[PDB]
């Protein structure tokens, strides 16, 4: 038979499942809704482990339970009463013999030890992967240190001593590859001559590589704490989502820099060379699976100032028109081809973050926090699972590093790019559009001629890499 349980009066997590406290989706069960007590019971269940559920719960629980209350509840879960001696044990003791204690030994082995170990696994994941709760609440950290540091008894001792050390390391807080990264490529600008760095003087291969390293690092830095609760859209977004906003602002700046390079090149022949170089950079972004970079270029070529430059378009080689067309097609039909390509490539890659943001926001806004059943309010956990499926996908692409060498000067050049200068956004984007009108006026105004601005060769070195010995 099943093990008997403590009385639900002394141990709250022994209450029977009912539709008044837990609802399952239609081989472990998947929870649709439940009380916080039932969620924590199943988070630390004696019959099976559920590592996905641990991640889902620890990513999303603050929408229904405060951190201080979660810790109180898992300490309550940990403190399981042992059953009293049975009749057979009683009779043995009355005869001066040692009891077999069969039921007690089974309850320890099959209920207490698995539940307690799974409580410690929640603590371990909490500290290792969601430590911001403790960074933001020093008293919560004190309570966790005290709880772990006072767990007695040898069955848990290895994990208790380990978790104590992990906490201490987290308070005061290297890549190996299958091959060597390729050699850094140089064009007109030579190493150390940062004052000459520009769109046409750096090598287009190396522009794409260094922007991919930068954009990969920005992508990898975004934590789920910046996303859950849609906090990057709210009034405190600069406090709660700084790495996400830094990533988006880089993308915006690069798109505007591409537009500025195009429309401030007033000579038609030179502007064709500028656009051609940008499409070559896009080609290397595609080869590197840097989809953020691909869309940075596509957004610039579809912007109002650039899109209308028909005289420039007319001189772009047919093959480059095709590269841009196939990049634009990734975004069509609500990113249908992009989503399929992302799921087919071999990482490393840099995803476009915007789709994730819209899906998290709409999942939050479009589903209720609670479900009302039999007069009770149950936490709608299915909604949180959907959010954590998105944050899980984000995290999966954050693991793989690029095998590319950093060039510190080129990196700094792109980190410090500031196309808008001190201008506000409206002022600057009006300026770009007025430049577009100046260099290619609306019909029937005649097309003017403009002097060259570049004194160095415009011929591209191409985007196939070189390899000396």
């Amino acid at each position: 038979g099943q093990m008997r349980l403590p009385s639900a009066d002394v141990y709250r997590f022994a209450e029977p499942d009912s539709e008044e406290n837990i609802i399952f989706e239609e081989g472990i069960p998947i929870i649709k809704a439940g009380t916080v007590i039932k969620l924590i019971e199943r988070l630390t269940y004696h019959m099976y482990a559920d590592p996905n559920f641990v991640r889902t719960f620890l990513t999303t629980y603050r929408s229904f339970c405060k951190p201080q209350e979660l810790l109180s509840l898992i300490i309550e879960r940990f403190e399981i009463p042992e059953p009293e001696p049975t009749e057979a044990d009683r009779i043995a003791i009355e005869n001066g013999d040692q009891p077999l204690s069969a039921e007690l030994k089974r309850f320890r082995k099959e209920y207490i030890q698995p539940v307690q170990l799974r409580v410690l696994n929640v603590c371990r994941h909490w500290v290792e992967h969601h430590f911001y709760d403790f960074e933001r609440d020093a008293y919560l950290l004190q309570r966790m240190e005290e709880f772990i540091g006072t767990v007695r008894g040898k069955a848990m001792k290895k994990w208790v001593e380990s978790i104590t050390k992990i906490i201490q390391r987290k308070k005061i807080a290297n890549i190996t590859f299958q091959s060597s990264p390729p050699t850094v490529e140089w064009h007109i600008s030579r190493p150390g001559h940062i004052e000459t760095f520009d769109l046409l003087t750096l090598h287009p291969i190396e522009i794409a590589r260094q922007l991919t390293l930068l954009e990969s690092d920005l992508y990898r830095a975004v934590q789920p704490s910046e996303l859950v609760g849609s906090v990057w859209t709210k009034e405190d977004k600069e406090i709660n989502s700084p790495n996400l906003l830094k990533m988006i602002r880089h993308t915006t700046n690069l798109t505007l820099w591409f537009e500025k390079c195009i429309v401030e090149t007033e000579n038609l022949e030179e502007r064709v060379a500028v656009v051609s170089r940008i499409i070559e950079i896009l080609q290397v972004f595609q080869e590197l699976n840097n989809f953020n970079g691909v869309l940075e270029v596509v957004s610039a070529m579809n912007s109002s100032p650039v899109y209308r430059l028909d005289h420039t378009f007319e001189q772009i080689p047919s093959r480059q028109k095709k590269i841009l067309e196939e990049a634009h097609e990734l975004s069509e039909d609500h990113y249908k081809k992009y989503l399929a390509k992302l799921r087919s490539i071999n990482p490393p890659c840099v995803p476009f973050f915007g789709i994730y943001l819209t899906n998290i926001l709409k999942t939050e806004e479009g589903n209720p926090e609670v479900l009302k059943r039999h007069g009770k309010e149950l936490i709608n956990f299915s909604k949180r699972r959907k959010v954590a499926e998105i944050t899980g996908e984000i995290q999966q692409y954050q693991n793989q590093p690029y095998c590319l060498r950093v060039e510190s000067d080129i990196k700094r050049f792109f980190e410090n790019l500031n196309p808008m200068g001190n201008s506000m956004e409206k002022e600057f984007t009006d300026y770009l559009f007025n430049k577009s009108l100046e260099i290619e006026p609306r019909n029937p105004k005649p097309l003017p001629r403009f002097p060259k601005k570049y004194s160095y060769p415009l011929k591209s070195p191409g985007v196939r890499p070189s390899n000396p010995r």
């Binding site: 849609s230 990057w232 859209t233 709210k234 009034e235 977004k237 906003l245 988006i248 602002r249 993308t251 915006t252 798109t255 505007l256 537009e259 869309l295 596509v298 957004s299 610039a300 579809n302 912007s303 109002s304 899109y307 209308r308 975004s331 609500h334 915007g354 943001l357 819209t358 899906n359 998290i360 926001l361 709409k362 999942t363 806004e365 479009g366 589903n367 209720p368 959907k386 998105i390 956004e425 409206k426 559009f433």
Partner: protein, 167 residues
């Protein structure tokens, strides 16, 4: 067969804009949503006895990608310009959204509707007369909607389709 209308929702973030399309496309009567589902933004409807397909682009949450607005707007035949009736800044943003749509579409007469959205019980700061006056100054309809009761939601999208049909 039937006509497809590509509609684009634009407006300030952080103030409940996404409720407009969610409530429309939703199982009207079951309050639930998976936006990742292929065609969670396509809806066949009958407007003035004529069946059509609405394809709605709502990039809510991507407002900080400000250099992508042209890319997204270029796809649209008609636009819902949404502000929150308890957020004056979102209302003051409308002029620039409209100017940007006119520029992307290269037209002074782009089908659009002004939508004032009630996203919570916080005090209204934009009165309906202010918004009606703004809409009239632009020559476009004004619709008010509730983010919670679905009131006005059908009217906003159907009015925009009529603006496209009568362009």
């Amino acid at each position: 067969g039937m006509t497809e209308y590509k509609l684009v929702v634009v407006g300030a973030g952080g103030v409940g804009k996404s409720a407009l399309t969610i409530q429309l496309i939703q199982n009207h009567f079951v309050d639930e949503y998976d936006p990742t589902i292929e065609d969670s933004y396509r809806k066949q409807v009958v407007i003035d006895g004529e069946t059509c397909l609405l394809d709605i682009l709502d990039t809510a949450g991507q407002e900080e990608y400000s250099a992508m607005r042209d890319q997204y707007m270029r796809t649209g035949e008609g636009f819902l310009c949404v502000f929150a009736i308890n957020n004056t800044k979102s209302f003051e943003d409308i002029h620039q959204y409209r100017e940007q749509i006119k520029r992307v579409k290269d037209s002074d007469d782009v089908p659009m509707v002004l939508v004032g959205n009630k996203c919570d019980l916080a005090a209204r700061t934009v009165e309906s007369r202010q918004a009606q006056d703004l809409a009239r100054s632009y020559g476009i309809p004004y619709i008010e909607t509730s983010a919670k009761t679905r009131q006005g939601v059908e009217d906003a999208f159907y009015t925009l389709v009529r603006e496209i049909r009568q362009h």
